[PDB]
Ligand binder design. Structure first.
Ligand SMILES: C[N+](C)(C)CCOP(=O)(O)O
Length: 257
């Protein structure tokens, strides 16, 4: 799976294209603005330990460490992206980025105050989503919180041709917001809050889309017209498909006790 992601969706250039539209240090939806919103009700301090699953270019960890002073440990399977993340942080002994497979990584039980993941678990098969959340349950401190956004979808029976092709090409496993919440409940998480944030996601996509159009000249200088068209069309589809709830954006927050 590492090779597949590194050689396709997350080639060096693919990562840089995504960073252009999401914002500096981000490959997750809504970049910095969504990060601020998602963490707006989260309480941590300088003694907190945070795990970021799918840490990408590191913007989320940078923000969490800046806001709270927390120790942040990001894991991402793509070695190239981790290398890029490590280039953007220096002199900070409370931020660590590690290239590894979260499904094989070992952490002590009762270790983290927050386990955070942004638009990363969609790569995992359903079997492996369940396996991951069982691990997360163990790794959380008794007082800890799990906080996730992820790509979700309407039931597969409702998918159209274009959406089927997108999911297939990306090799995503997209489940409903409801099924996702059920996995967390089955893993024994408490106070499971799930929100279908597709409308907010649509707003985020529209801001990103407008930015792309307004900065087309700069994009073409950095990249190419072919890549602009692909990105433009991809965002257009996500805007259309989120409006009609075919492609959805799920938010999940839960606790160990
Ligand atoms: C999923 N992601 C937010 C990390 C990257 C963008 O993926 P996609 O919207 O092009 O499928």
């Amino acid at each position: 799976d590492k090779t597949f992601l590194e050689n396709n969706q997350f080639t060096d250039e693919g990562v840089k294209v995504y960073e252009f539209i999401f914002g500096e240090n981000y490959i997750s939806s809504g970049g910095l603005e969504a990060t601020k919103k998602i963490l707006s009700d989260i309480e941590l301090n300088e003694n907190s330990k945070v795990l970021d699953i799918g840490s990408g270019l590191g913007g989320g960890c940078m923000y969490i460490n800046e806001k709270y002073g927390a120790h942040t440990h990001g894991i991402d399977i793509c070695s190239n992206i981790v290398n890029m993340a490590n280039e953007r942080v220096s002199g900070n002994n409370k931020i660590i980025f590690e290239a590894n497979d979260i499904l094989t990584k070992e952490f002590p039980e009762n270790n983290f105050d927050l386990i955070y993941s942004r638009d990363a678990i969609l790569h995992l098969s359903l079997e492996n989503k369940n396996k991951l959340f069982q691990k997360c349950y163990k790794w959380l401190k008794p007082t800890g919180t799990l906080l996730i956004t992820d790509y979700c979808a309407t039931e597969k029976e409702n998918w159209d041709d274009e959406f089927k092709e997108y999911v297939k090409q990306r090799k995503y496993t997209l489940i409903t917001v409801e099924e996702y919440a059920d996995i967390l409940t089955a893993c024994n998480f408490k106070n499971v809050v799930s929100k279908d944030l597709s409308d907010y996601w649509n707003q985020l996509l529209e801001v990103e889309h407008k930015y792309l159009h307004e900065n087309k000249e700069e994009f073409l200088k950095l990249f190419s017209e072919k890549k602009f068209i692909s990105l433009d069309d991809g965002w257009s589809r996500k805007i259309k498909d989120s409006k009609r709830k075919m492609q959805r954006w799920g938010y999940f927050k839960a606790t160990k006790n």
